[PDB]
Design a protein around this ligand. Structure first.
Ligand code: CA
Ligand code: CA
Lengths: 126, 126
């Protein structure tokens, strides 16, 4: 609703990850452009680009989302508007999750300070 | 509701973290016992203990939640019931979050595959 009409840029090296995020934002009325790479996100973020936000995966080979953001910010300064850039951390989350299960934990608590989530994590009682 | 009446054990080295989680579970009717340490979680998890679940912080000095879980599982096998053990990953999440902000990202997307969360992360439009 509120992000209806806006143009997001979704950067991830993983096609399934792109597909999920872009379908979610497509649902909310955003129109979405993807990019498989930091190098390509910078190509698409040039001097006059018209993007309203950007969902940037932090774990990519060759150039990770942290560098491609340092670059986007320096791109913007040498061109002087703040492109809001939000990190997609599912790569890190999945890795700690395997690390949990692997020492015999029965799962993890997403959003670890939100009540409804601590409930949702405990259905070893039904 | 569903976890009303059950006895959780909340293991964390951080008093504020303990206070939050235990107050959330206290709200839901659980009665809660804490522990500041892996060593103390194992003391409280002995041969006949009566706990129904356990929220285990993965980052503690001296003995981290991963080891104290390997120990709890070996404690249980040498005593042979599966104590459901859920990991609290806020230590890792906070660290990647600083790592995001520090290269000039405007935030991160919690629960990176849930739609309502990708919306909630974008209020650079209001
Ligand atoms: Ca990735
Ligand atoms: Ca901790």
């Amino acid at each position: 609703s509120l992000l209806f009409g806006k143009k997001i840029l979704v950067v991830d090296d993983n096609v399934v990850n792109r597909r999920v995020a872009a379908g979610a934002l497509k649902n909310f009325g955003a129109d979405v452009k993807c990019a498989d790479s930091g190098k390509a996100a910078l190509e698409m973020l040039q001097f006059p680009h018209k993007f309203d936000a950007c969902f940037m995966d932090i774990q990519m080979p060759e150039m990770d989302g942290f560098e491609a953001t340092r670059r986007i910010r320096e791109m913007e300064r040498t061109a002087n508007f703040h492109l809001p850039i939000l990190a997609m951390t599912a790569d890190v989350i999945h890795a700690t999750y395997e690390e949990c299960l692997k020492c015999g934990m029965d799962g993890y608590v997403s959003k670890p300070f939100e009540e409804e989530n601590l409930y949702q994590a405990v259905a070893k009682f039904f």
